[PDB]
Symmetry: D2
Subunit: 171 residues, 4 copies
């Protein structure tokens, strides 16, 4: 059963946030580990990242935030709406005011790529509240700007300008 007392709820939320941070950091370290002359350290990094994922999933289930697929899609829709309507524009404008190139560039990349996720989730929710699965194949993702390309893949990136060969395929 979901926890009700406030303090244990706060503690579990903080634990989930920490475990997610740890898993993401380990994933980031693994890429550089495999990019250097130590191919077998990325194995350990990915295994322990999976362990942190398991811990975070256990914490998430403990709070009882998981339901059916339509509710998960609704939560994703709300999260995506908050990430490209309120947070990122303000962060980009603050970074412009303070005058630093890297933060402005990163938020520029992240600001223009999040507008599609909400549409995809809404389509999935409209097609999932009845008993049927959507049709999709060979989703392309950029490794430099995170740009969701569905089915067809543009020859060059309309955000950074990377060639189509550089993309990663999820099928």
């Amino acid at each position: 059963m979901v926890v009700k007392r406030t303090m244990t709820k706060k503690f579990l939320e903080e634990a989930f946030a920490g475990e997610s941070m740890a898993h993401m950091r380990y994933l980031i370290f693994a890429e550089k580990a495999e990019q250097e002359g130590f191919p077998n350290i990325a194995k350990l990094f990915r295994a322990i990242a999976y362990a942190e994922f398991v811990h975070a999933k256990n914490h998430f289930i403990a709070l009882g935030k998981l339901g059916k697929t339509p509710e998960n899609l609704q939560m994703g829709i709300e999260g995506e709406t908050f990430e490209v309507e309120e947070m990122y524009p303000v962060y980009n404008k603050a970074a412009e005011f303070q005058g630093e190139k890297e933060a402005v560039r990163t938020t520029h990349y992240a600001l223009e790529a999040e507008k599609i996720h909400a549409e995809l989730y809404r389509k999935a929710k409209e097609k999932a509240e009845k008993g049927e699965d959507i049709e999709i194949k060979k989703v392309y993702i950029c490794p430099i700007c995170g740009y969701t390309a569905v089915d067809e893949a543009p020859e060059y990136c309309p955000v950074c300008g990377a060639p189509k060969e550089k993309f990663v395929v999820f099928e």
Copy 2:
């Protein structure tokens, strides 16, 4: 250049935290979607999670926290030590005092399964600054509690008693 202003650094740290949380949530959503008759929505969730990973990696690179393997290995060691020694016993004590079965069980699993990551990382560091690669193969991870079993794997999980075949191998 690395971000030196305080407000932009705080903004980017919060954005990194949000992206990591979103990526973890999307991975959990995909895991749930595989369990129902929607194999394609799991693909969509995985692709969007990889996009969130790219966003968070760009945010992490902007802050300049990434370097060579010894430094991020030491960072992982510090994080694991902090997680095992201080936070988890306190959370377990608080959950025991308030009296939630789920929080106590999850914290018990976490504090009993997280003890080996620090030792593994500590050993690995003193070989990744001289120039060689670690000799570890075929790592095992439990899918319920998450206990890193290196090379050989026990017949049953000492923490939860899961069968051997349930283990997720990495090689």
Copy 3:
């Protein structure tokens, strides 16, 4: 009109928190300043603390949480209930587990003296929704572990045992 946007609401809440912390810090600084040989620096600290109070009051008015007293007492009642019931026992248990004399002593002084505020506020609210002011006089307070003594004053503080002459009277 009240502030409706989420991001700027969060910004104003954080600013209010910072102003309150600064005002508390200045009020604490003034007491030590007057304890030494500088009676004018205490005056400067008091004036600057009042300026911070004005800032925080403006921030509070902007967010729109201040209104008529009959409904205003409810926020204080809820805050006192949360402080006495949930937050403080957990902190006391954690400080006992980690083993710090100062934290345990401070929490023990805290939870045992915060119990009367909720009762006083409930009585004030249920006597003050008809247009009449409550009949109360000479509220006493201990200067070490403040225990809200109403009207009459005990000879010694039941919590710390301080003499009666040290009580700070309000009239």
Copy 4:
């Protein structure tokens, strides 16, 4: 002895923040209460606010953040520098971007009056490390924009435009 373990430090810092918030809220409620037909409610509000101040002071001393006046003034100097350089300009620009009148007005009042506090603290500090007290009298504070006037007080407020009769005297 100062608290050294991390979790107790976090808990005590959160408690201090909560107590400061409670004190400020109670002060504002008292000021509203005395503005209407109930005079004696403000007495109770101010008494319990003093109790919250005592609790916050105990928590602050527990973390051992208090020293002599020379070093005490440094914390105020740094706080004012951060408040007037980083936080308020960014908050004002964000409020301008989102387009709300109240937040822009409050931040405009706040950012134009905090520049003199750092100078006052520095002037007090240079005279404090030698062993003597500064000379100051009749400090005026505006009650609708927080504006520190030293000795002489202008006829009209150069920020809001209030007459010099409305000010409050801190002697």
